């Protein structure tokens with residue numbers, strides 16, 4: 739679990755969005771595993787606008803943060819799960835790092851701010867859904 743709170747928006751993994759997220763829907767994209775909902779309170783986070791490929795993510799299954807090197811956002815095949823059929827997920831960045839299903843939502847950050855959230859993983863890999871291209875989150 740986990741969310742990014744920026745301005746009047748809450749960004750979560752689309753497969754973990756609640757009934758309240760869907761009732762206050764701003765935008766969603768199944769191909770990216772992202773959903774954004776509106777909030778009444780002003781959010782706590784800042785979004786990076788950069789091309790960093792190193793950062794630090796929070797791993798809830800270890801209660802620890804880990805440094806990572808990650809690929810540029812791209813279209814990557816993701817195996818079928820209880821939430822989606824087998825498909826290509828876009829704007830996804832992969833890294834070598836520990837992750838378990840419940841780790842989805844952990845924030846990845848570089849020195850400029852929030853880069854994305856954990857969205858995929860397995861066998862010593864961790865994948866993050868990029869949010870740096872969503873310029874409207876800050877406007």
Ligand SMILES: COc1cccc(Cl)c1NC(=O)N1CC[C@H](C(N)=O)C1
Pocket residue numbers: 753771816819821822827837838839840841842856857858859860861
């Ligand atoms: C951190 O995620 C994992 C870690 C270890 C093993 C596995 Cl199968 C995962 N993947 C998942 O649980 N999912 C749920 C839906 C999500 C998606 N974006 O399609 C992938």
Ligand SMILES: [Zn+2]
Pocket residue numbers: 786787788789790848849850851
């Ligand atoms: Zn950066």
